[PDB]
Ligand binder design. Structure first.
Ligand code: E5E
Length: 340
């Protein structure tokens, strides 16, 4: 590790810790924004495109229903998400610009990235070439190097959680499962196709699960489909734990070798979790053409630039039923979300 990387990560940790210890709170309110379009929706929350009425800036506003968060046992996860997001700073992480709460909801107002989810682009083109997949993978490697050095585990890597920005670079979203962890953690969370074996088997697990997920992501980017798939989760899990993966013949030998080391069932042998840490990945032959510093500095020409007309264009996102943002006249779940 060049002292330059050590000193970068030491300063990164100092800056993170200062914000972690003293989190920002209550930095805007709902009526500062106009609602434009629902960009995504789930069992306890939504992401909305909004426009700030005074500056005209567009943002992606994540709205979480406090009662549903409680019911689906997401309290600590939502507190993790906001506390981490307000404390991190890296070129490939979506920035949290404001947060606040009201009687009914929690709000995280993030940068809006108009290029859409990697998932859409991957499905439209079919599969990415190895250089294209490598460009995105390198950004994830650097982002995980950053996060893991802060004792953070991300726990939701997948194409739907990676947005393509105006320059063609990655912006990681969706910190709902991210957690500050020294050692092990135990919660069953993630997305089935991306779960490491040790999550499936209810073990105490660590940052190695993020490196496993990177193997899944790289396979999916280069093949067009993930390595372990089936009609039901239990059948996916049987495949994940088996230690067997098949590679398309069009994969390069270097790609197959990297993937066997990321998709290593034995977490004590998995790249990213050995004595040399991230450098086993950064020094692998599949990354020989990668200029890590140039990627970090965003000096590499991207494989493609999403097509969009301006900062408010939603054409790269899909259409959802537009529901109200209702705020109760009575405070709900105040105690549970005191720190938010
Ligand atoms: N999974 C992506 C998520 O819905 C989303 C969409 C647009 C954004 O700018 C964002 O920060 C998050």
């Amino acid at each position: 590790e060049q002292e330059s990387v050590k000193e970068f990560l030491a300063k990164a940790k100092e800056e993170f810790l200062k914000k972690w210890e003293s989190p920002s709170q209550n930095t805007a309110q709902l009526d500062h924004f106009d609602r434009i379009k629902t960009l995504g929706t789930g069992s306890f929350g939504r992401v909305m495109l909004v426009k700030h009425k005074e500056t005209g800036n567009h943002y992606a506003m994540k709205i979480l229903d406090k009662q549903k968060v409680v019911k689906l046992k997401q309290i600590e996860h939502t507190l993790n998400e906001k506390r981490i997001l307000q404390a991190v700073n890296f070129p490939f992480l979506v920035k949290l610009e404001f947060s606040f709460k009201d009687n009914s909801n929690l709000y995280m107002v993030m940068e809006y990235v108009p290029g859409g989810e990697m998932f859409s682009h991957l499905r439209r083109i079919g599969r990415f070439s190895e250089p294209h997949a490598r460009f995105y993978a390198a950004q994830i490697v650097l982002t995980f190097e950053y996060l893991h050095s802060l004792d953070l585990i991300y726990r939701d890597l997948k194409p739907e959680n990676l947005l393509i920005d105006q320059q063609g670079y990655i912006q990681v979203t969706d910190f709902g499962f991210a957690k500050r962890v020294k050692g092990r953690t135990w919660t069953l969370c993630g997305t089935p196709e991306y779960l490491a074996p040790e999550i499936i088997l209810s073990k105490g697990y660590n940052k190695a699960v993020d490196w496993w997920a990177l193997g899944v992501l790289i396979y999916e980017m280069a093949a067009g489909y993930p390595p372990f798939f089936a009609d039901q989760p239990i059948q996916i899990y049987e495949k994940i734990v088996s230690g067997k993966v098949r590679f398309p013949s069009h994969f390069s030998s270097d790609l197959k070798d990297l993937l066997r080391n990321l998709l290593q069932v034995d977490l004590t042998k998995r790249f990213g979790n050995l004595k040399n840490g991230v450098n086993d990945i950064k020094n692998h032959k599949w990354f020989a053409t990668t200029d890590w510093i140039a990627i970090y500095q965003r000096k590499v020409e991207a494989p493609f630039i999403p097509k969009f007309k301006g900062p408010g264009d939603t054409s790269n996102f899909d259409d959802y039923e537009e529901e109200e943002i209702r705020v109760s006249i009575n405070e709900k779940c105040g105690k549970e979300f005191t720190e938010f």
